[PDB]
Amino acid sequence: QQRTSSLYNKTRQFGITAALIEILSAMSSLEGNAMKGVRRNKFWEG
Amino acid sequence: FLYKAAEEKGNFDNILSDFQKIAAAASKLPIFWERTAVVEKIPEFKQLSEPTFFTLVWMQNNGMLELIQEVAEVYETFVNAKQKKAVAKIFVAPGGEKNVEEARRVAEELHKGLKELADYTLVLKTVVDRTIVKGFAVELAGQYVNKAEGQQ
Amino acid sequence: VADHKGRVGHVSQVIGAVVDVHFADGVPPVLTALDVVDKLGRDEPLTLEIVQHLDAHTGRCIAMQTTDLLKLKAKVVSTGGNISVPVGRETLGRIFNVLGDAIDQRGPVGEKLRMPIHAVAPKLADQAAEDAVLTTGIKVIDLILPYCKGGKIGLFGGAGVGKTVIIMELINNVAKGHGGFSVFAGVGERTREGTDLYLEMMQSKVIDLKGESKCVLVYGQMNEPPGARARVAQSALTMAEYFRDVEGQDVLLFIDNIFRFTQANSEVSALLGRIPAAVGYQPTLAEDLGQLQERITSTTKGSITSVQAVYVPADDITDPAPATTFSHLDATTVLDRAVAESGIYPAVNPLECASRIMDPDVISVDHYNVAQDVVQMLTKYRELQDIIAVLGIDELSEEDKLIVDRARKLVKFLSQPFQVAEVFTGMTGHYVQLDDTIDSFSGLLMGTYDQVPEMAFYMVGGINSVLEKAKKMAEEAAELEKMRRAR
Amino acid sequence: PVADHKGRVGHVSQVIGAVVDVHFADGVPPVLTALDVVDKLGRDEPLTLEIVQHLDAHTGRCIAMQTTDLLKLKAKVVSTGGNISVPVGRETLGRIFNVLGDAIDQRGPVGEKLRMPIHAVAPKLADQAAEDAVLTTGIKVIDLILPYCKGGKIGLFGGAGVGKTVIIMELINNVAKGHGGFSVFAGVGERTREGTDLYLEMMQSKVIDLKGESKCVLVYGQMNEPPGARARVAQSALTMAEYFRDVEGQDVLLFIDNIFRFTQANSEVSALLGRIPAAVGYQPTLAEDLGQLQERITSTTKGSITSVQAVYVPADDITDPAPATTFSHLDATTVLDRAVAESGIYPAVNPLECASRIMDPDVIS
Amino acid sequence: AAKKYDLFGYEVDTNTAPWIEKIKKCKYYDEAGEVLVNMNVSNCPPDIATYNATLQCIYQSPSKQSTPVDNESKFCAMMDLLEEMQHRNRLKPNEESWTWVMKECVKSGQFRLGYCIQQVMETECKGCPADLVKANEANAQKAKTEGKEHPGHLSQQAGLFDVKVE
Amino acid sequence: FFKTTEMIGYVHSIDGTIATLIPAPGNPGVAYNTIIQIQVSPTTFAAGLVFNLEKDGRIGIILMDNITEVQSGQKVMATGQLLHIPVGAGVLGKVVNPLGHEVPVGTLGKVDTGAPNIVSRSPVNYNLLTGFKAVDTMIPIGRGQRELIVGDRQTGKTSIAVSTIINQVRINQQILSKNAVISIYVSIGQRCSNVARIHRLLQSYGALRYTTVMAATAAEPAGLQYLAPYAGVTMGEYFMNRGRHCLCVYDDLSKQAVAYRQISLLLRRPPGREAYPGDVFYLHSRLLERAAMLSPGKGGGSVTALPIVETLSNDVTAYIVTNVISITDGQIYLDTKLFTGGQRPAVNIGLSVSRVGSSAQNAAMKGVAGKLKGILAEYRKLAADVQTIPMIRGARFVALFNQKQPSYFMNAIVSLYACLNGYLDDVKVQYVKFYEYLLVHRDLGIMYGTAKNKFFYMYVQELNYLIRFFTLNSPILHGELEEMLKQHTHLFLQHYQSKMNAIKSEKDVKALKNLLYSCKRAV
Ligand SMILES: Nc1ncnc2c1ncn2[C@@H]1O[C@H](COP(=O)(O)OP(=O)(O)OP(=O)(O)O)[C@@H](O)[C@H]1O
Ligand SMILES: Nc1ncnc2c1ncn2[C@@H]1O[C@H](COP(=O)(O)OP(=O)(O)OP(=O)(O)O)[C@@H](O)[C@H]1O
């Protein structure tokens, strides 16, 4: 019970991490494919 | 933008000359001049037309001066379409551009086959391809004919 | 920009099943249907459904067919409205797809009206209180988690536990004699299963080609792209709504599997620029399912008895999809793999099931009391099983063993051979009446059958079948004794 | 012949870690091409780059085999006219080499007859062998439960401090010394001292006769080396083995330690290359990289290569994508368990999780 | 005469006369199966007559194909064909089909299969053609006297340690 | 009169096994999921597949061959057609790539077809004999069925499928070619050597005449590994649409998903669970839905699928494994513990299931399987919770399930019937295989001159089809069947078991041990 409670905690701690690298990998691939465009700003007025 | 501005005046060859000057000037500029560019300061660009210089300043503001050689290609395509000119690219080996008599004949035959380009005027543009050692290739409106050979 | 019918656009982007369309006159309203008219050399027509507006001119859409041979700048024409499906009694006995086109090769269908698949759910004032028991002819369901007419039923289970089989048994027992109509929606399931269902229904005369049929089939299956599997459920639900409201009939609505509706939307969610939620589902999981489920309800005009099969991925009932569907049901039937591995079918875990009508006011007092006693005994039996493994059966007191002996009979008596699983079991099915089940369990609890052998309750119907099996068991045992005696 | 891009001049445009972008006016050379940085930059050693991607018709992304310290933008780079080539032949026997093929033993010039590129295509189906025989190692567990196959592929999966290296040395002593054919030791991301100890041991056993004929070649890119070198030393060592197998029809032993560092190195560069990472954080091309490398490690109709590869299991997690993918590329698998070692049992082989292909009555008695 | 309908209610072509003529013009009986395949593709399910013609071609054909095929057996093919007809098509074999099988067994010299077919005709059909029953018994007599009633290796005396388990 | 291609643009970037294209201004453009040719030389082209069409006009390309020859700036030509590969009987006995190119050894079908419609199918009623008693009895497989083979590494996933292909060789030689079973073995991400060993193994048994191999080795790019199942099934759909039956084996789908993940991530597709793409289920779903049993109106052909899947530490909770299990009509679970315990094939009957059921069993096997199923169920429970008949026969059934090569139907059904009717009650469990070997490869009655049967003998291989027609429990065959078993049992017990139980010498004991172990690997 102290060998299945140290693997119920080493396995809860790797889920919170592995499931956050999976959200933040999608976020980073949904961000780089959102390309920056030509800005219709007043470059003369500055 | 450069096509719309030129259309109002009705002259398009001025832009083409401006690109030619830009290409000639860039050959003398230091490496990676696009990233250290103040077009206002560069004297070579002082002789350009207002639309071209305006566009160059527009790019420099966004740091996209590396697209000069590609915007020109699009502008030429618009001009050729407006003027009803069909350009056939003749890909030839380096130094093999001396003989293009067959290339012109092939280009004309392709032009005849294409019904859309019936009214368009045929033009030939030579390109050097290092992948072919002998022969030539002709491309026109997507129709590509290969009569070339490379290293064995 | 009121009437967008015939409006023209051009395809701008194509990535998988998601297509971006550019309209010069303004993107049509969301959920609008578009046809890609430009002939691209395809063997099948291409239709798109708008899901988002990127700007005043650009709109993102999901295709219903494969996007193969699709080029940029192809010509798109709006249909002037959402996806429309035929409705009415003329659809009875027929098979349809997500687009409402018949695929039975049985000739044109005479449609007098078409309705959009997307509709607003009934409001609070349009809710009807119908508390009446539905007799499915199954001992476990009728006793522990009785079903309610006009309500919602879920069959939560993993893979291979018997979700599809139970639906077939329910159809055979409830649909053949149903006064009203029936609608079956196959969603992201095996195509052969639908074929077997179609053959069975024709044999049972539910679908009478020469006469009058009383059921409709709508199939969008695994082979179909995610766009079709995310809308087939709406199409069939639209047909049921018409029968409920316009015809004022009591209709049955079977869905298998509703999870695929969630799965399909998750597949396209990534390409729509939506950050995934936990596990990997779309952030709009709860909302999208809620809108659909609220439409599946019984109103003051008519009643819809809905049976939905839910797939619990990897037998993990904590998964967002199975859990989100628990609150949208009136009766939940949870199947467990361990029960099936023990030879018990249907593999229902009564401790995890629940029903809304499990109240004395709705059902008879005897029914309520018997069910609770069964549940308590099963709960106590499981507690004893832990002791029986550590101490052994010998250590248990007189009272405890009596609970063990009675409980084991209850576990085996809950099993029942279905009329549709004869090939699987090799024995004829049984249809147990509601009264017989209550009486049979009531006697068992108080020890009226303590002397009956345990195996006599295994894979049988009512109490009468139990006695006959016990008699047969006694006869064969006597024959074996006689053979041993001669030796 | 001579490459059409040799002497081509480019300029450095971007530097991030060990990843460098080079812009060529006349056109980026072919992928896998080797480039040399000409600018002095005050560096203590030369700088060499290998092209791995094409960003555009003129720009190419490359990995540096040495540290990129004191590297500025606009620095001048010259193409070498071909991929990274290494010496081959008997001249390399008894010598120590690095990823670039330069001798590091402080001894006379190699004087090789020729050189061959590290990157090469794998043998095809028709060039595969069909010979199964038992290699006797002298170890009870291996020779009984998971016997090794001559000319086959062997893997030693283990954690840290479990016995992977020890078993390799035992195999080397019991096989390589009494081996008619040649041997190649490929150190990849391992302790430098181990290479030194091996070099002394091979000299004492006279497998390396400094004044006579030797039977062993050493190729070492170790932990201290940057990721670029650790991702290519295995290719160079394997290329030498290929030459002996084919050009001479000679049996070869190939002791690789550790192969996991090869995958780890490609992971480090891939993160810098701007690739979305797969599960755990490995590069998406993990399987392809191993497949190209392992398929070259095979026995053909011309010769035979018996390969023994040490595999490191990070955090003792055998489900990690790196070791997990390697199982399908091995004829013999030897799994080591930390708990078994802690019980005093050496070797720590876990026979239940071990397997072999020649465990067939048609092959063994 | 009467339109037949398939499993799903669609009608099936019943004019199977031309296909029978094609079957009766084959050289090797494997080509007959191709005709049956074409019939099924054309939604023209074979009838009892078609199967009997196929059996006749098998009996009268020289071999399965132009080139020999190892372990080819006319009896096995015909029995499999009957299995398809009765089980996967719901058609009862008639006397003609069984007679063809009995003729093949007699022709091939397989006198033990003839006994089983003889009982089958005596059980399902009405007896057996007495010409073939006598011929089958005659085949048995020949090897009954030739010392080839049972393959000899089977009859060799063996022992616990005298059997070679390959 | 010119062979004018359709140039659409140039190659911009290359990242390993994928590339990106920039379209030349004013060009026709390319269509989605079409094939394109990258001109690596004026006469040499590299194949690519369109995967993405971006707003910028850039195109994502999956390379298939001649990758090393691809460079930035090269021209690209558009064929404008989907992927079509050679199909026909002229490909059997050959090794090919997903593109149809043949691999030297030492009609065009579309790869993106749709699955058969609901009304174009028929119920599964024709068995496909694997040759293994455990599978054929407890896990029936029917033509037109998708039966997963899920297990851990080194458990027999490949061997069982190969044996299934081999078991059809003997059958195909006898029956007409109409009912012959063709085989399409697809190797995905496997070693090139293993393919060669498989090719030789198939050649030894003569299975190449009815089999073809489609290989996408590990060294090959991910694109080929991604298309191999679709190309393989396409070759098998040629026979399905022409009134013939086929069997497609995928070894294995686990490595296909890795390739698809590799392609998607490189081409900037947003990731999902375990970094797999969102539409990973739809990948396998459309692959396995193409395997069906066509209706009588369309020819009656079929394709049988035996996808193979690998797990880690017997974890069937993984992502792709769960998706495939939800698709197939059944699963054969190979357990590591049973494999190391001596049970081979290591089929876990409890975790294995076939949703087709008895409908995919021959009338002869139905009766045996149904009664056998009840005995085993009781046997599992009895031991889990005393020598009774179910427990006596259950162990012998288990011992009979150990095999190394596929068994002929006649031999297998007869042995099961004998154990079912108690003929093996007096036979010790250790000697069951030896008893079976004598029954099949010997005839005790003839040896001792006590055989009175007229036709029913185990050496008459032609009896298999008679058994498959009338059933063992029929008057024609039942009477002689019981007599033969009764004689075989009595002779076996008297002359063999008595001596075997009387062995005490170490030399004799060792010799007996070798015999019995050999009998396991013989029958
Ligand atoms: N066969 C053996 N007998 C006794 N002790 C051993 C044996 N193998 C290993 N050990 C012990 O384990 C230690 C580590 O062994 P080894 O150098 O082989 O590790 P490894 O597997 O190479 O790990 P790493 O290289 O990651 O450090 C040795 O120093 C020794 O103490
Ligand atoms: N029925 C069997 N009886 C005895 N040995 C068997 C049997 N089936 C397979 N084997 C042996 O078991 C080993 C593994 O078999 P196989 O190649 O089929 O595994 P696998 O499932 O393909 O594993 P992997 O492909 O991951 O290596 C081989 O040595 C094979 O000869």
Ligand SMILES: Nc1ncnc2c1ncn2[C@@H]1O[C@H](COP(=O)(O)OP(=O)(O)O)[C@@H](O)[C@H]1O
């Ligand atoms: N009533 C039953 N009796 C026996 N076996 C059953 C029964 N119901 C289901 N099964 C088992 O489950 C299989 C069918 O599974 P199915 O109903 O499709 O489940 P799901 O759709 O949840 O995966 C059958 O082949 C059989 O093995």
Ligand SMILES: [Mg+2]
């Ligand atoms: Mg189901």
Ligand SMILES: [Mg+2]
């Ligand atoms: Mg070490």
Ligand SMILES: [Mg+2]
């Ligand atoms: Mg395998």
